[PDB]
Design an enzyme around this catalytic site. Structure first.
Site, mmCIF file in Angstrom:
data_model
loop_
_atom_site.group_PDB
_atom_site.id
_atom_site.type_symbol
_atom_site.label_atom_id
_atom_site.label_comp_id
_atom_site.label_asym_id
_atom_site.label_seq_id
_atom_site.Cartn_x
_atom_site.Cartn_y
_atom_site.Cartn_z
ATOM 1 N N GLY A 35 -37.871 21.865 -8.833
ATOM 2 C CA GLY A 35 -38.633 22.551 -7.827
ATOM 3 C C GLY A 35 -38.610 24.057 -7.989
ATOM 4 O O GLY A 35 -37.940 24.557 -8.838
ATOM 5 N N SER A 36 -39.328 24.753 -7.120
ATOM 6 C CA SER A 36 -39.398 26.185 -7.148
ATOM 7 C C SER A 36 -39.042 26.702 -5.755
ATOM 8 O O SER A 36 -39.128 25.974 -4.773
ATOM 9 C CB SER A 36 -40.788 26.596 -7.604
ATOM 10 O OG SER A 36 -41.715 26.258 -6.615
ATOM 11 N N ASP B 171 -26.244 22.921 -5.355
ATOM 12 C CA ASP B 171 -26.469 21.685 -6.096
ATOM 13 C C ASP B 171 -27.113 22.040 -7.433
ATOM 14 O O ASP B 171 -26.621 21.618 -8.449
ATOM 15 C CB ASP B 171 -27.330 20.695 -5.315
ATOM 16 C CG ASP B 171 -28.671 21.284 -4.839
ATOM 17 O OD1 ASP B 171 -29.473 20.430 -4.446
ATOM 18 O OD2 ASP B 171 -28.935 22.535 -4.899
HETATM 19 C C1 LIG Z 1 -30.091 29.286 -1.924
HETATM 20 N N1 LIG Z 1 -31.191 29.477 -2.862
HETATM 21 C C2 LIG Z 1 -31.156 28.722 -3.990
HETATM 22 C C3 LIG Z 1 -31.486 27.409 -4.147
HETATM 23 C C4 LIG Z 1 -31.846 26.485 -3.207
HETATM 24 C C5 LIG Z 1 -31.413 25.176 -3.348
HETATM 25 C C6 LIG Z 1 -31.738 24.202 -2.431
HETATM 26 C C7 LIG Z 1 -32.564 24.525 -1.373
HETATM 27 F F1 LIG Z 1 -32.840 23.679 -0.519
HETATM 28 C C8 LIG Z 1 -33.039 25.823 -1.225
HETATM 29 C C9 LIG Z 1 -32.669 26.768 -2.149
HETATM 30 N N2 LIG Z 1 -31.356 27.097 -5.435
HETATM 31 N N3 LIG Z 1 -30.987 28.316 -6.061
HETATM 32 C C10 LIG Z 1 -30.895 29.289 -5.235
HETATM 33 C C11 LIG Z 1 -30.443 30.557 -5.512
HETATM 34 C C12 LIG Z 1 -29.711 30.842 -6.657
HETATM 35 C C13 LIG Z 1 -29.224 32.139 -6.896
HETATM 36 C C14 LIG Z 1 -29.486 33.172 -5.986
HETATM 37 C C15 LIG Z 1 -30.209 32.882 -4.838
HETATM 38 C C16 LIG Z 1 -30.680 31.581 -4.625
HETATM 39 S S1 LIG Z 1 -31.620 31.139 -3.240
HETATM 40 O O1 LIG Z 1 -31.239 31.905 -2.012
HETATM 41 O O2 LIG Z 1 -33.019 31.122 -3.709
#
Ligand SMILES: CN1c2c(-c3ccc(F)cc3)n[nH]c2-c2ccccc2S1(=O)=O
Ligand SMILES: CCCCCCCCO[C@@H]1O[C@H](CO)[C@@H](O)[C@H](O)[C@H]1O
Length: 337
Positions: free
Chosen positions: A33-34, A162
């Site tokens: 996902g993005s 995760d």
């Molecule tokens: C928590 N978020 C996230 C997420 C994430 C994972 C699961 C969700 F439901 C929403 C965001 N994956 N990676 C990031 C992340 C990694 C490094 C720095 C910042 C972020 S993020 O704030 O975009």
């Protein structure tokens, strides 16, 4: 009732989200996902919104989607990513084809944040371990802990993710994983933490292997070849015979390897980076190690509620995983403001 949604196009696709979320801005993409940063007008919080890609395209994807949502719905801990919200634009099961997950926006991953002082190493490893005590207490094993799965804010607050935003993964992997061992200890993760902690202390990747065989070679140089105690437990004949054909090597003295590091840090590394998974320190034992004396509070290192992973052994149809996910979306209760 249902909020009002709006549509816009970001990172080559359409995002349909509740009005409550404003000013979406891409942060990155991962394998499934993005993610966009947004402003949550209901809380005044900055949030990260993940839109799953092709969540129900196959059985594989549909079960993956379900696994992710079930997992994120269960996590309620300060050092683990949790769910502020989950939503879909679909008004019924029939039109259900999209899933968005919301969490707190974090500033950076530990890749991006890395030369650290010993006090910063202490606090960061502390928080990792505190999160791991919680995950492990529910019988969840991360299996891919690495710096890009650890999010950190400028005040050094840290959360285990995760999956992060996509530094070889193999570099932080327990040796048993690379030998394709049947089953895993919760202390595959402890190995990972040891690799991360070493790197924070020295500024260098501890075991930068070019592949799995080079990886093991680099590992065995530091920790030495398996002893008779560990060989007793190896059921695979090919693994035994190969391991016993290696030119034996003794464990290195870690104080010389990690020259100048806090000796308490060194002692902890020696308890993490043991080849025999049964002899590694646990996350709960590590939290009490003297290295964390300024942060350890045994009345504030909680365990998780039991987590039912029986779904993992079921083989269901693509619409059944989709319906189960839809149920989870519908039953979501937000956390308190
Ligand atoms: C928590 N978020 C996230 C997420 C994430 C994972 C699961 C969700 F439901 C929403 C965001 N994956 N990676 C990031 C992340 C990694 C490094 C720095 C910042 C972020 S993020 O704030 O975009
Ligand atoms: C050549 C390097 C190979 C070293 C392999 C050592 C991995 C040892 O760790 C092993 O982990 C298993 C859980 O996965 C346990 O079942 C075994 O009891 C334990 O000894």
């Amino acid at each position: 009732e249902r909020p009002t949604f709006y549509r816009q196009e970001l990172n080559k696709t359409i995002w349909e989200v509740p009005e409550r979320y404003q000013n979406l801005s891409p942060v990155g993409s991962g394998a499934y996902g993005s993610v966009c940063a947004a402003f949550d007008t209901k809380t005044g919080l900055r949030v990260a919104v993940k839109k799953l890609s092709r969540p129900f395209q196959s059985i594989i994807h549909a079960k993956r989607t379900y696994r992710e949502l079930r997992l994120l719905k269960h996590m309620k801990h300060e050092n683990v990513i949790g769910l502020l919200d989950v939503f879909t634009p679909a008004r019924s099961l029939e039109e259900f084809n999209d899933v968005y997950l919301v969490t707190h926006l974090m500033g950076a991953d530990l890749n991006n944040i890395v030369k650290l002082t010993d006090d910063h190493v202490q606090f960061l490893i502390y928080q990792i371990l505190r999160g791991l005590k919680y995950i492990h207490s529910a019988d969840i094993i991360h299996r891919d802990l690495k710096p890009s799965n650890l999010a950190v804010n400028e005040d050094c607050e840290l959360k285990i993710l995760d999956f992060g935003l996509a530094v070889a993964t193999r570099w932080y992997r327990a040796p048993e994983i690379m030998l394709n061992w049947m089953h895993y200890n919760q202390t595959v993760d402890i190995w990972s933490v040891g690799c991360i902690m070493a790197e924070l202390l020295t500024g260098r990747t501890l075991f930068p292997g070019t592949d799995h065989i080079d990886q093991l070679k680099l590992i065995l140089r530091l920790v030495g070849t398996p002893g008779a105690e560990l060989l007793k437990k190896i059921s695979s004949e090919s693994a035994r015979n190969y391991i016993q054909s290696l030119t034996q090597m003794p464990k290195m003295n870690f104080a010389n390897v990690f020259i100048g590091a806090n000796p308490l840090a060194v002692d902890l590394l020696e308890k993490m980076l043991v080849l025999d998974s049964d002899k590694r320190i646990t996350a709960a034992q590590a939290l009490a190690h003297a290295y964390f004396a300024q942060y350890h509070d045994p009345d504030d290192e909680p365990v998780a509620d039991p987590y039912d992973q029986s779904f993992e052994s079921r083989d269901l149809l693509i619409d059944e995983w989709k319906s189960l996910t839809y149920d989870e979306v519908i039953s979501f209760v937000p956390p308190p403001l």
